[PDB]
Design a binder for this molecule. Structure first.
Ligand SMILES: N#CCc1cccc(NC(=O)N2CCC[C@H](C(N)=O)C2)c1
Ligand SMILES: [Zn+2]
Length: 140
């Protein structure tokens, strides 16, 4: 589990969105595994606006933050799970690192701010849903 809290937005994995998220919906995209809902309180996270390929992510199944090198956001085939059939996920970045299903939502960050959240995993790989292109998270 986990979310990004930027401005009056809450960014979560679409597959982990709650009823309150769907009832306060701003934007959702199943191909990216992302959903954004509105919040009453202002958050403290800031979004990175860069092309870094190195950063640090939080792994809840280890209670640890790990430094990683990650690929650029791309269209990647992801195996079937309880939440989606086997399909292509867009804006996904891969790295070598530990991930279990419940690690989804952990933040990946670079020197500029939050880069994305854990969205995929298995066999020593971890995948992150990028948010750096969502410029509207910084306003309104
Ligand atoms: N190998 C292995 C098992 C394993 C370990 C660790 C994680 C996973 N699960 C996943 O990657 N996802 C399940 C939630 C939905 C995700 C999505 N964005 O489509 C895909 C699977
Ligand atoms: Zn950066």
């Amino acid at each position: 589990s986990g979310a990004i809290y930027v401005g009056n937005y809450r960014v979560v994995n679409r597959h982990l969105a709650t009823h309150n998220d769907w009832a306060n919906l701003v934007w959702e995209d199943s191909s990216r595994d992302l959903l954004v809902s509105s919040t009453t309180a202002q958050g403290c996270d800031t979004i990175a606006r860069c092309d870094c390929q190195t950063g640090v992510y939080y792994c809840s199944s280890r209670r640890k933050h790990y430094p990683v090198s990650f690929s650029k956001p791309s269209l990647i085939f992801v195996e079937a799970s309880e939440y989606y059939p086997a399909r292509y996920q867009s804006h996904l970045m891969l790295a070598v690192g530990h991930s279990e299903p419940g690690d989804c939502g952990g933040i990946l960050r670079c020197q500029h701010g939050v880069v994305g959240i854990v969205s995929t995993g298995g066999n020593g790989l971890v995948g992150f849903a990028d948010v750096r292109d969502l410029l509207w998270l910084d306003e309104e």
